[PDB]
Design a protein around this ligand. Sequence first.
Ligand SMILES: Cc1cc2nc3c(=O)[nH]c(=O)nc-3n(C[C@H](O)[C@H](O)[C@H](O)COP(=O)(O)OP(=O)(O)OC[C@H]3O[C@@H](n4cnc5c(N)ncnc54)[C@H](O)[C@@H]3O)c2cc1C
Length: 415
Amino acid sequence: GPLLVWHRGDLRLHDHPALLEALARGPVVGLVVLDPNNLKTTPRRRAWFLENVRALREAYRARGGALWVLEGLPWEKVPEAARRLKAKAVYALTSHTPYGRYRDGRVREALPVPLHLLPAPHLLPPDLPRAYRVYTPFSRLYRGAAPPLPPPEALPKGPEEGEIPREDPGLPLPEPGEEAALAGLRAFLEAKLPRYAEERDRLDGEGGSRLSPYFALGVLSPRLAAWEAERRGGEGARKWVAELLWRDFSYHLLYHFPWMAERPLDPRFQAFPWQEDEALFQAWYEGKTGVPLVDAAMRELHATGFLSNRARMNAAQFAVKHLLLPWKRCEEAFRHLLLDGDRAVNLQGWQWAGGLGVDAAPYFRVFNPVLQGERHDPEGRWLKRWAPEYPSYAPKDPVVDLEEARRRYLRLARD
Ligand SMILES: Cc1cc2nc3c(=O)[nH]c(=O)nc-3n(C[C@H](O)[C@H](O)[C@H](O)COP(=O)(O)OP(=O)(O)OC[C@H]3O[C@@H](n4cnc5c(N)ncnc54)[C@H](O)[C@@H]3O)c2cc1C
């Protein structure tokens, strides 16, 4: 009987504990279940997922192995695959998300054979005992990346089943799959890593790796990335790895403070006068606020599904501090437009850029839409690409009075 390796947010063969744990015991067959709880989202994200699932199968085939793809509820499809294959056991990577736990508990209940869950690779586990709300103390626990596990050279033969739907992303998608991700990592490390600390703030984000869409679906292991970067060493690597840690910190936060999905980490904001004005929401959502920077960010986001970190913190804080739009609605809409949309990470980003309690970031910090755009975009090349209509980062008929908007917020916050 074979062993089933059930892939979830880990569409890769490199550094995969569940794959190697099963392979060491006997022949394996891979499995992906197209779950409605995950796929009932926007076309761009659904396609990104499906195309990376298609790539994993090609990766299995290239090695002579078999990847089954089934559609439906995990607690019905996993047991079905196990029965049909007469699998002895199922192996997967542990998930600590609310849905992940519910799902796996349900699957364990319906499965007649063992479900073995192994720790997913992280720089720092999210289920650490101590619960930190600040980054520095959390990051100190990190003592360098452990070595990544190797991918199999070849896979045992097995029967293949299931078809992989083709969805219209509505936009240009990056190259899907692990090979593309690995090629991207090498390019970044050799070319951009050295100056990362000095270029990581550009509004166009060309100083970054642009690997978030891959990390989001586990096409690239963070442990492998950290390991490679640290092999290069230097200020660049230290800084880039620090950002990988911010991702783990995001999972750590949501795991220890589940309620932050519902309310701000900082209690003294639980009752902020969020003015829900449908008219303003659309202006922001469509990037029609009249503010060069924000409009540029939202426009690129709608067209590409990607946005540099600097742009995200600008477009995000603008909505929360200036327009006072409720964060909950804005964060969901933001996530749905991102190819790398990750609930935990997006939530930390919003509660951080929105001065809602993450890393005890100060509320009094308020970005200056025009300065920001000039200090992080030289010949205004970025602005000229997403909002040519604007001659500069100067407000041309703003949906609100920046100056008053600032005073307004600071006033509200101060109390
Ligand atoms: C309001 C807001 C929302 C965000 N939502 C998401 C989201 O849904 N999904 C997502 O992947 N990232 C999110 N980020 C974090 C971040 O902006 C990206 O990970 C980054 O822009 C990816 O570009 P890159 O791959 O070139 O990053 P690089 O600079 O090359 O960094 C490498 C990796 O480190 C991680 N990383 C970098 N910055 C951060 C950060 N601030 N927090 C957590 N991890 C980080 C990412 O995995 C990234 O791929 C958000 C940030 C903000 C301010």
